[PDB]
Design a protein around this ligand. Structure first.
Ligand code: NA
Ligand code: NA
Lengths: 240, 4, 240, 4
């Protein structure tokens, strides 16, 4: 055949892959964590969005730390040979490097490690996408008026917020980040490479949202998501 | 608006 | 005029901007830090690469922590009104969140903060690029055989390695990451958007390099760089 | 090859 190029992930396997959505809304009383009003709007929007991208969506609700770890372990031990990719969405409370099960924290590194190139061989060389709506600390953004591959290769962590910062969720509309992500996937998944879609999500969150609070400490604040890419190829949700 |  | 689109940074200001290269090779004896053989190859390659992209390059060598902070403060207080962008390259020892001056550490957050949207007003809305060749910890990758904007918006941190991991430097050829970055900028800066260039850098580092050591602990190891993007637009080094 |  003629000249060939290899700059994008193969996304024409028989299946696009799994999309696991972990939706933690209600937390055990002893943890003192508040209920996350609006997160069901997010989970529903994500399910529809990834359905239209032809992912096999599995929604999970109110998982303990033990259940999260068991779920990730079990999914990583499935045969993904006929799947192009893997997507995991985490909706919960969090801190830097941490997302909360309903009864306590789980290390993000522990979750991701199940899918390492050496530990999940049917996903080696395939994109593994982790989308995270959770806080990364307690900072607020005041804004300004205008042979081998690495075992950690082929991961992308699409974070809702910058390292060290809170992440914002609206109790009626859902989270700023997930709202924006779904809108941009709906509009551009048949048009743009995934990093460029996520850049549009960055712009949407950065420009169109600002917090409203009766508490001066929390009022008029801003948010910028953070793309953490260890991908080695361009990712298009469409093929041919 | 609430924080996570 | 006709329909207009606004998806990419304006890069046709009179000047592309500054490219500050901080090259720390030799460290104060009391720190116990080793000399970084090969880093001059990196600094020279970077100077030439960014010269050809029409950046005003300033090379700095063997700066103390105090000198690094003073330099960043002074540069952030320059008038960047006629400049499209800002680039800072840090070549040194490091740990997670830290790069070393010749006599002790500097917080990466402190460096970046000088250029916040509210603190450097002549760079507000313009891309601020930090390229970092430094360790982020001591993990080794064994590989596998195959109104307002946020003050933190418009930053990109192009890290040589994944969070928690060592970064590799060859004493003759320079660092894997900077070698690869310069090669990909030379080949693709007139062709590809910056995230796509950095993705090619990820692939090059991931596939073409593997460590050789007489020490089994350090032998046959791999590396994946990590793109941390809080950019809100596509970035092309060319215009018109 | 050396580490940083
Ligand atoms: Na959000
Ligand atoms: Na490197």
């Amino acid at each position: 055949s003629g000249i060939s190029l290899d700059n994008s992930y193969k996304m024409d396997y028989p299946e696009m892959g799994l999309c696991i959505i972990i939706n933690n809304k209600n937390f055990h009383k002893s943890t003192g964590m508040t209920s996350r009003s609006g997160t069901d709007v997010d989970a529903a929007n994500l399910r529809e969005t990834f359905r239209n991208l032809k992912y096999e969506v599995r929604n999970k609700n109110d998982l303990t730390r033990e259940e999260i770890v068991e779920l990730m372990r079990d999914v990583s031990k499935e045969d993904h040979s006929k799947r192009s990719s893997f997507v995991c969405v985490l909706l919960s409370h969090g801190e830097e490097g941490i997302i909360f099960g309903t009864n306590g924290p789980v290390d993000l590194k522990k979750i991701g490690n199940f899918f390492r190139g050496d530990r999940c061989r049917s996903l080696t060389g395939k994109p593994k996408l982790f989308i995270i709506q959770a806080c990364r600390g307690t900072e607020l953004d005041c804004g300004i008026e205008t042979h081998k591959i690495p075992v950690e290769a082929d991961f992308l962590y699409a974070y809702s917020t910058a390292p060290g910062y809170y992440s914002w969720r609206n109790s009626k509309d859902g989270s700023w980040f997930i709202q924006s992500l779904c809108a941009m996937l709906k509009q551009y998944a048949d048009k743009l490479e995934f990093m460029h879609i996520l850049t549009r999500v960055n712009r949407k969150v950065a420009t169109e949202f600002e917090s409203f609070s009766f508490d001066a400490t929390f009022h008029a604040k801003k948010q910028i998501p953070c793309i953490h890419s260890m991908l080695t190829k361009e990712l298009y949700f469409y093929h041919h | 608006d609430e924080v996570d």
